[PDB]
């Protein structure tokens, strides 16, 4: 992962990157999601957007990392992909993870 | 009239660089869509796809034309790219159309072109 | 990739008949099915996308159905012009494979 070139954004919070291969850890987590493109600056422990309280909160004791790349080719259409949807109203910010 | 038109068939011998055109009208904001190849083995098979605005390219595994299909901007010439050949295998060849966006079905067909080796 | 067979084969009925063809899958896939017409001499046509779902220039003869792994297709009356050729498409992951085929006549 860390070689490839395609990957727009890389930046890992508790480990460094060039060290993750000689780390032992109990279980990995890989959640997957879409958003747009100015909604990945969000992605961060502590944030105070519409993504950070009512979609995919993250916990400020973050330790793996994000991984993000643009993806135009497979989601979009000469239309619009009406197939991805956000929560956009709530009652109250959602608890990390 | 939205329609994919093809040149004529051809035969020539192995070792000679085969190419065949499949030309894109009827419609605007050409290049945004998906184009590529159905091999046509009814006695069925699908071919890698490419993208003509950034020339992304996919491909099946068991199947490879090894072409890097590429569109000018003003004649969106997508031919396929294929300047090599082996005799043993026939790559009878529709060109289609994609949707594109999830909608991966093949919604526009080609009429295609009978093709002989050897 | 996904392997996919289409049990029915080669069928015989006379004109106005019910018919049903069936096109298992290796594992489920959520409904990403396309049925495709084919004739002698002719390129393929596509007839049906998302699989329940009838596309524009098709009699209502054809319909759709299954979930899943069970997918079907029903055509209640059979017409003269309906000796032809089905394919099966799947395309949940990207190696798009095809299906055996149906012949009917």
């Known amino acids: 992962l860390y070689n490839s070139a395609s990957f727009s954004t890389f930046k890992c919070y508790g480990v460094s990157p060039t060290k993750l291969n000689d780390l032992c850890f109990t279980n990995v987590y890989a959640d997957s999601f879409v958003i747009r493109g100015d909604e990945v600056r969000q992605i961060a422990p502590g944030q105070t957007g519409k993504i950070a309280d009512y979609n995919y909160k993250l916990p400020d004791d973050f330790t793996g990392c994000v991984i993000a790349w643009n993806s135009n080719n497979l989601d979009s259409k000469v239309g619009g992909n009406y197939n991805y949807r956000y929560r956009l109203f709530r009652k109250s910010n959602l608890k990390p993870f | 009239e939205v329609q994919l038109v093809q040149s004529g068939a051809e035969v020539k011998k192995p070792g000679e660089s085969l190419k065949i055109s499949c030309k894109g009208s009827?419609?605007?904001?050409?290049?945004?869509?998906?184009i590529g190849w159905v091999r046509q083995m009814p006695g069925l098979e699908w071919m890698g796809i490419?993208?003509?605005?950034?020339?992304?390219?996919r491909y099946s595994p068991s199947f490879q034309g090894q072409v890097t299909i590429s569109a000018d901007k003003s004649i969106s010439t997508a031919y396929l790219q294929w300047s090599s050949l082996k005799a043993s295998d026939t790559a009878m060849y529709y060109c289609?159309?994609?949707?594109?966006?999830?909608?991966?079905?093949?919604?526009?067909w080609g009429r295609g072109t009978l093709v002989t080796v050897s | 990739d996904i392997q996919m067979t289409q049990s029915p084969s080669t069928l015989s009925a006379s004109v106005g008949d019910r018919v049903t063809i069936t096109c298992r899958a290796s594992?489920?896939?959520?409904?990403?099915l396309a049925w495709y017409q084919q004739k002698p001499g002719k390129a393929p046509k596509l007839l049906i996308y998302?699989?329940?779902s009838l596309e524009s220039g098709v009699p209502s003869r054809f319909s759709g159905s299954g979930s899943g792994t069970e997918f079907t297709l029903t055509i209640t009356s059979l017409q003269p012009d309906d000796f032809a050729t089905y394919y099966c498409?799947?395309?949940?992951?990207?190696?798009?494979?095809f299906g055996q085929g149906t012949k009917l006549e």
């Open positions: 490419v993208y003509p605005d950034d020339s992304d390219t």
């Open positions: 289609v159309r994609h949707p594109g966006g999830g909608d991966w079905y093949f919604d526009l």
């Open positions: 009827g419609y605007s904001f050409t290049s945004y869509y998906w």
């Open positions: 594992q489920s896939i959520s409904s990403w």
């Open positions: 498409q799947q395309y949940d992951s990207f190696s798009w494979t």
């Open positions: 998302k699989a329940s």
